Amino acid sequence: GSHMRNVAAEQQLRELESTFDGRLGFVALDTATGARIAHRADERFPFCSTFKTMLSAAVLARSAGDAALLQRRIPYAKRDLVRYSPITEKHVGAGMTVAELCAATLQYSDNTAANLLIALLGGPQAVTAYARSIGDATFRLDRRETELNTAIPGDERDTTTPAAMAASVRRLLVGDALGTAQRAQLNAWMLGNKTGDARIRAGVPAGWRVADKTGTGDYGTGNDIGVAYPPDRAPIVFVVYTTMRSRNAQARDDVIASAARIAARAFV
Ligand SMILES: CC(C)(O/N=C(/C(=O)NCB(O)O)c1csc(N)n1)C(=O)O
């Protein structure tokens, strides 16, 4: 790694953004030194499902002082299901444990699981309050699934910046936001993600294991956040937010993977 390479990488990100009609928000952090590669680091983007990492962390933090919270089973009916409930739709009735709901929302992006957990914590503002408690003054959760993914720009609801989210992801997965057992559990879940094969994972070498959470929304919004763990050097934090100008736009997995690849190559 070198300063020269990082500056060149930021230029490559500018060039990558020029290839599509949208915005690229990007922060990668090499935790060996805190070196950063960024683009639009301080602009707000809709986080979409990437908030499920902050949500699950809040649940884990509560569980640290709330005996057997993770084992509590929350019942729900078929009429309670939100659009896109690939795991929870199989357990209607008695429901699933809090731990199982965290796993479902992180690994499959299950929306009913997310809403059940948001409600358990006392509403969206409890997730925001948790973010504040780990030093994130930027993150805000205002709505539930699936409304938080939608456009009804100037709307700041359900947004964060790439820089704020990178710091929070670093603190949660590598640093000192959670207790050691809780940090290990969050990593364990996110390393098992099933929805990110075409995003950050597609931009890093085959030996780097990636704990990530994706997000997708209106205006072709395509996001992925997480940490890559090389076997032989310090973890690297990746935050990629993309959103398009056209409401009809598709998300761009290829752009997300290319952005990650730019930083992975520059750092190592
Ligand atoms: C598939 C993919 C990308 O998308 N997930 C959703 C969904 O609502 N995601 C909210 B979030 O991932 O931003 C979804 C709604 S209908 C459907 N199929 N998927 C995901 O699970 O990650």
Numbering used by the authors: 22 to 173, 184 to 248, 250 to 262, 264 to 301
According to the publication:
In class A β-lactamases, a conserved structural element called the omega loop5 constitutes a wall at the active site that shapes the binding cavity. PenL has been used as a model in exploring various evolutionary paths to substrate spectrum extension through amino acid substitutions, deletions, and duplications. In this study, we demonstrate the extensive perturbation-absorbing capacity of the omega loop against TR mutations of various sizes, some of which are large enough to include the entire omega loop.
By contrast, the glycylboronate moiety of CBA exhibited a similar binding pattern in both PenL-tTRs, which mimicked the acylation transition state of β-lactam substrates and was similar to the bound conformation to other class A β-lactamases, such as TEM-1, CTX-M-9, and CTX-M-16634. Although PenL-tTR10 and PenL-tTR11 exhibited differences from each other in their enzyme-ligand interaction patterns, their binding patterns were largely analogous to those in SHV-1 and CTX-M-9, respectively. Consistent with the structural data, the CD spectra of PenL-tTR10-CBA and PenL-tTR11-CBA showed that much of the altered profiles of the mutant enzymes were recovered upon CBA binding in the far-UV region (190~200 nm), reflecting induced-fit reformation of the active site. While PenL-tTR10 reconstituted the original conformation, PenL-tTR11 appeared to exploit the flexibility of the omega loop, allowing large conformational changes in the active site structure.
